[PDB]
Amino acid sequence: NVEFNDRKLLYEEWASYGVFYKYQPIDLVRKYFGEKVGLYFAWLGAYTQMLIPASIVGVIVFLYGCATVDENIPSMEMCDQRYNITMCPLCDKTCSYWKMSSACATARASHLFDNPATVFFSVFMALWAATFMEHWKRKQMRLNYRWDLTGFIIFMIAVTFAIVLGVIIYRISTAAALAMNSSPSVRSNIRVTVTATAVIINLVVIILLDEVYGCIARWLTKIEVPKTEKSFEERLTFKAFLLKFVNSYTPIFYVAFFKGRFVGRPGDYVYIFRSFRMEECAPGGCLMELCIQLSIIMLGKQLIQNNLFEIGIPKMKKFIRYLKLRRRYEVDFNLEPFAGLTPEYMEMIIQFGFVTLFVASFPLAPLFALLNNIIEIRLDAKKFVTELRRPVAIRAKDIGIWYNILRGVGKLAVIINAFVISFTSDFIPRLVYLYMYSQNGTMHGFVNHTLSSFNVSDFQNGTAPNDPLDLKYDISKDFWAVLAARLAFVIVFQNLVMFMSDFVDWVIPD
């Protein structure tokens, strides 16, 4: 019914602004596009429906930490005046009050969720991800039943990856190049949109850099010469992912663990509380999650930015054919062949890496990924009727070639956030005990404000340099206190979660 299959997909697949408002059609795609193309959406369909429960919990989190501080303002004023020492050696009557508590307005949306909301939420995602991956494993068996009733050389890349890990250099350059663009020496508007430049300065850059590799790995496999032609994508995707994986997440890891650390600068409290970009960004504090929130914020939303290119790039090629034009398959000769399925999943799993891996930075991470998918489903299936004049109807099944690859990213989901979730909200649940050991417990966690902050910082240059207090040398050893505690979490976390996650694919897959 091409008068219908078009229009039924023309008309039951052009919601294109939000939901269809009716349902989600699957089986009919299985008749028109075959098995493979349809089995994409049936995955992309399940990927959305599972975000909803976890997405909503995000809004339940923001409402938590906000309303956990919106009503009795518990950790605002005590938190709005812990930074007000942060520039004391910097004041010295000269440049005294510039940004001492400037972190406060920036400290809120971080310092609002950490212990109860973030440290919780990751445990649901990892438990969720196993729920998801276990769910799809079975739901794939369902549609597998319907069709099953109706089925009648290597070291060269190792140098290439090390090439990619030099991309950290590339982020640093334009990060150093924020000065030549606007140079905002302010607190209200200069903090945000200063880094957001180099982000958008850079986050554009990876985009053009992305399809570079697609011509790279495509030929870089040809040196391998895979015997079975069908297994070419295996050596293709498996190469194509790892490239694009570390191509994308790498800046975040630089802004996740490495940026704050690795800070060697002598000179004590006389010499520390000023030496920071020549005192024009934040003499008080960094609050790296803000940089970590933001840079994911774009990447969560830049999946919409580049999204229009998915419709814009193909229609833009019409300018080429139309230009040659003035300067039933008859008209069908003037549209690109499909040749594009792995980019379809590939857009998703680079999205899936954000939902699960970096999930203790901001809990709303599922939510932005849910907004795109409603567009992502509606854009793509649009692109199959609107564009892609030649469906192959390959009519294979069994998406497992990705099922490991998506599942593997689930396997990373526990270590990474574990360090994220450990090294940012674990001064507090043990700093109850150094200071408030006598009669000050969980109702007295608002006591370590000036005490824990009386020193240089909280990080590696936070506890070591305390010698001129009383006399690095004789005092950097309380550093060993927490750095066991940070560690002690992970050995508690990944073991439980990897076991708790072991529940889900233990009774549910059967």
- Give the number of other Cβ atoms within 10 Å of residue 392's Cβ: 14
Angle at alpha carbon of residue 388, lines to 384 and 390, rounded to 5°: 110
Q: Which listed option, Ca ion, a second copy, none, makes contact with residue 477 (CB within 5 to 8 Å by class)?
A: a second copy
Kindly tell me which residue out of 28, 392, 483, 496 binds a second copy, with binding defined by CB under 8 A. 483
Smallest Cα–Cα separation from 211: which of 349, 302, 300, 343? 343
Cβ 42 to a second copy, closest distance in Å?
A: 28
Angle at alpha carbon of residue 362, lines to 360 and 363, rounded to 5°: 80
- DSSP-H helix ranges across 86-118: 88-91, 103-107
Kindly tell me which residue out of 35, 80, 289, 347 binds Ca ion, with binding defined by CB under 5 A. 347
Annotated binding site for Ca(2+): 134, 307, 310, 344, 347, 376, 380, 505, 510
**Rounded CA gap, 195 and 175, in Å?**
7
How many CA atoms within 13 Å lie on the side-chain side of 38? 23
Give the single-character DSSP code of 254. I
Cβ 463 to a second copy, closest distance in Å?
A: 12
Kindly tell me which residue out of 201, 481, 496, 505 binds a second copy, with binding defined by CB under 8 A. 481
Q: Which listed option, Ca ion, a second copy, none, makes contact with residue 484 (CB within 5 to 8 Å by class)?
A: a second copy
Q: What are the phi and psi torsion angles at 286 (to 5°)?
A: -90, -55
Q: Which amino acid is at 80?
A: D
Q: Which listed option, a second copy, Ca ion, none, makes contact with residue 307 (CB within 5 to 8 Å by class)?
A: Ca ion
**Rounded CA gap, 254 and 251, in Å?**
5
Annotated binding site: 134, 307, 310, 344, 347, 376, 380, 505, 510
73/491 with CB nearer a second copy: 491
Residues 440-479 that bind a second copy (CB under 8 A): 477-478
SS3 310: helix
Cβ 239 to Ca ion, closest distance in Å?
A: 20
Residues 248-267 that bind a second copy (CB under 8 A): none
Q: Which residue is nearest to Ca ion (CB)?
A: 303
Is residue 401 a contact residue for a second copy (CB under 8 A)? Answer: no
Query: Of the listed pieces 101-109, 308-316, 399-407, 457-465, which binds Ca ion according to CB under 5 A?
Result: 308-316
- Rounded to the nearest 10 degrees, the angle between the axes of helix 288-305 and helix 365-386 is 20
- Give the number of other Cβ atoms within 10 Å of residue 309's Cβ: 11
Is residue 412 a contact residue for a second copy (CB under 8 A)? Answer: no
224/387 with CB nearer a second copy: 224
Residues 274-303 that bind Ca ion (CB under 5 A): 303
> How far is C-alpha 476 from the chain's CA centre?
34
Cβ 441 to a second copy, closest distance in Å?
A: 21
Q: Which listed option, a second copy, Ca ion, none, makes contact with residue 456 (CB within 5 to 8 Å by class)?
A: none
**Rounded CA gap, 316 and 463, in Å?**
57
Is residue 26 a contact residue for a second copy (CB under 8 A)? Answer: no
Is residue 244 a contact residue for Ca ion (CB under 5 A)? Answer: no
Cβ neighbours for 448, distance < 8 A, ≥ 6 positions apart:
428, 431, 432, 435, 436
**CA-based torsion, 353, 41, 371, 498: positive or negative:** negative
Kindly tell me which residue out of 90, 310, 353, 357 binds Ca ion, with binding defined by CB under 5 A. 310
Structure tokens at 79: 């938190």
184/391 with CB nearer Ca ion: 391
310/426 with CB nearer Ca ion: 310
SS3 14: coil
485 CB-contact burial (10 Å; exposed 0-12 / middle 13-18 / buried 19+): middle
Query: Of the listed pieces 118-126, 270-278, 379-387, 413-421, which binds Ca ion according to CB under 5 A?
Result: 379-387
Is residue 384 a contact residue for Ca ion (CB under 5 A)? Answer: no
Q: Which residues bind Ca ion (CB under 5 A)?
A: 303, 307, 310, 347, 380
Q: Which residues bind a second copy (CB under 8 A)?
A: 415, 477-478, 480-481, 483-484, 487-488, 490-491, 494-495
